């Protein structure tokens, strides 16, 4: 947990500056992100692991496939937009194995 | 007199600063000093 | 020529001294290095407050942040901009009104994107740009249908005339967001730059060729960005502005491209667009090609200055004071983040 | 019917959060999501948070470590593990080690 966390203290900041380049070129692109939720395209499934004889809930990271924000930066986004995804993407899969 | 200009020169003082108040307060007073920047390097909002 | 000399200065003249005026104010290299040496957002303030900025961040609460600072500065440019359209006469009005039809685009995709989700107009009023504000009131207490709020936008809008590139007010549930937002972009461009060369003389010279890049990046980037997308090549080719250079048979082969490859070799034909391409290196650590572009649309908004009796200054000052305080804005970022490696990708003006 | 993951954070952290996919609108239109604005105050992140916390097919919730601060009192009450919540960092405060609710367990650190 503790290095799990000192790498979030950097997984996490890669993530935000990621967002702040997409910011640059994108713009003002938080509100139609949450304005346009639909479905969620990550949902979690409850898995169990066992040490002695006390089982440990812990957590699976599964696609849905329902993606909502293509097209999202289609006229000026698009590679910033793109690389934010695939960012927050890896700090979604840090954070579910540290949950 | 208004012929032509005044004879302007430049000059310096070094003055102790718990004068320095006093001793400028007198100069704004008298009217005849015209002081400069002399620290441009850092902007006038943090000297 | 139509010898713009002539009568250009009888009503517009006053403002176009005044809108030179303002861009002489836009941060220098040696403005924007200062900003750059700085360590915090406070000490940001306090340099900034030597250009022609001044106290427009002074007011506001001593924890500075980077919303509040690019808030700051897009209430001052829209400041600026009212105060110029409201000075302007008929023709400049109707250009510096063509400027702010690209914020109202934004504006009407953001309230059919509330609607469709059944949420307040009035609601989403207050996330609307400024510069495009939707002050007519046929389009509020819309009720959350939106065949009404087509209806307003064709009736008590001036996206009316855009608006006819659909077919009904069932699009609006129909198309996706995006792809109205960027067919109401290419009715935009087309009728501004039809717009512009009526003008003609100094204002189409000088502004055909900004709408002209406009178009041919706007296809570069969309053919870029819909590779890996269920935007199929045929429903793309519709959202291409024909302005660009590249309509005859270049934005063919762009909505045939399949790869960035042939994006690549179709931009090659056009060598202004090949150095920029050739420069969008685009992997990590240098420009890349929406960076390029930006430098690209900054030259072109600067040698619009070297005319002097046109329209084209306007609106070569508002994109290159946006692009101004979106570098400050960067800037903050990076001093906030603490990530100064990429403090130098702001993109330089004058 | 697997759970959801919930944010509680600045309006940056939430969409970069959203462009991951972890927002979604159920049978009643309930967002599992709050941005965190200087309108909204201690109340209504504690309101939001217990409301998230409630639900059942929540799964993981995220708080920026100034938030969790704000509303450290429900974070230290809420003891049960199901509801996996984590404290992330922020481009507005960075994140410390102490003073988490999870490590509150641990002295060996």
């Known amino acids: 947990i503790i290095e799990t966390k000192m790498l979030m203290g950097e997984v996490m900041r890669e993530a935000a500056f990621s967002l702040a380049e997409a910011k640059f070129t994108a713009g003002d692109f938080s509100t139609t992100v949450i304005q346009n939720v639909n479905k969620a395209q990550v949902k979690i499934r409850a898995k169990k692991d066992n040490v002695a004889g006390v089982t440990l809930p812990v957590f699976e990271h599964y696609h849905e496939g329902t993606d909502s924000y293509e097209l999202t930066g289609l006229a000026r986004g698009g590679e910033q937009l793109a690389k934010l995804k695939r960012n927050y993407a890896k700090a979604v899969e840090l954070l579910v194995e540290l949950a | 007199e208004l012929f032509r200009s005044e004879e302007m020169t430049l000059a310096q003082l070094f003055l102790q600063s718990e004068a320095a108040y006093c001793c400028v307060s ?16 850092v902007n006038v909002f943090q000297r | 020529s139509f010898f713009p000399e002539l009568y250009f200065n009888v009503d517009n003249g006053y403002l176009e001294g005044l809108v030179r005026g303002l ?126 709020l087509y209806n307003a936008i064709l009736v008590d809008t001036p996206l009316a005339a855009f608006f006819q590139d659909c077919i009904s007010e069932q699009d609006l549930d129909e198309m996706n967001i995006e792809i109205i937002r960027n067919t109401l972009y290419k009715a935009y461009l087309e009728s501004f730059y039809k717009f512009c060369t009526l003008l003609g003389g100094t204002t189409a010279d000088a502004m055909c060729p900004i709408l002209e890049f406009e178009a ?110 979106r570098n400050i804005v960067w800037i903050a970022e990076c001093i906030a983040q603490r990530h100064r490696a990429k403090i130098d990708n702001y993109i330089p003006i004058f | 019917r697997g759970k959801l993951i919930a944010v509680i954070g600045d309006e940056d952290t939430v969409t970069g959060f959203l462009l991951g996919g972890i927002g979604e609108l159920n049978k009643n239109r309930h967002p599992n999501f709050l941005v965190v604005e200087k309108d909204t105050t201690i109340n209504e992140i504690e309101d939001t948070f217990r409301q998230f916390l409630n639900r059942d097919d929540i799964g993981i919730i995220l708080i920026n470590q100034y938030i969790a601060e704000m509303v450290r009192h429900a974070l230290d009450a809420h003891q049960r593990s199901i509801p996996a919540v984590l404290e992330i960092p922020s481009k507005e405060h960075p994140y410390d080690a102490a003073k988490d609710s999870i490590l509150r367990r641990a002295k060996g650190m």
Do not use: W
Request: proline share 4%.
């Open chain 3, 23 to 148: 861009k002489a104010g836009v941060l220098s290299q040696a403005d924007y290095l200062n900003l750059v040496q700085c360590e915090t957002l406070e000490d940001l303030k306090l340099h900034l407050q030597s250009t022609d900025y001044g106290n427009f961040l002074a007011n506001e609460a001593s924890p500075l942040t980077v919303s509040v600072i690019d808030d700051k500065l897009k209430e001052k440019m829209v400041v600026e901009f009212r105060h110029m359209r409201n000075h302007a006469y008929e023709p400049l009005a109707s250009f510096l009104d063509f400027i702010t039809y690209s914020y109202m685009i934004d504006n009407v995709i953001l309230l059919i994107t509330g609607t469709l989700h059944q949420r307040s107009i009035a609601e989403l009023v207050p996330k609307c740009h400024p510069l495009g504000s939707f002050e007519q009131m046929e389009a509020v207490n819309i009720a959350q249908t939106p065949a009404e």
């Open chain 2, 26 to 41: 007198e100069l704004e007073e008298l009217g005849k000093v015209q002081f400069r920047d002399l620290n441009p390097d």
């Open chain 3, 216 to 325: 041919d990046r706007r296809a570069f980037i969309i053919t870029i960005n819909s590779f890996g997308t269920e935007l199929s090549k045929e429903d793309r080719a519709k959202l291409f502005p024909h302005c660009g250079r590249l309509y005859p048979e270049g934005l063919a082969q762009l909505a045939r491209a399949d790869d960035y490859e042939q994006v690549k070799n179709v931009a090659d034909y056009y060598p202004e667009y090949k150095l920029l391409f050739e420069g969008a290196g685009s992997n990590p650590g240098d420009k890349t090609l929406e960076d390029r572009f930006f430098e690209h649309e900054v030259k072109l908004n600067k040698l619009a200055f070297l005319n002097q009796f046109h329209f084209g200054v306007f609106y070569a000052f508002v994109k290159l004071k946006e692009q101004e305080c």
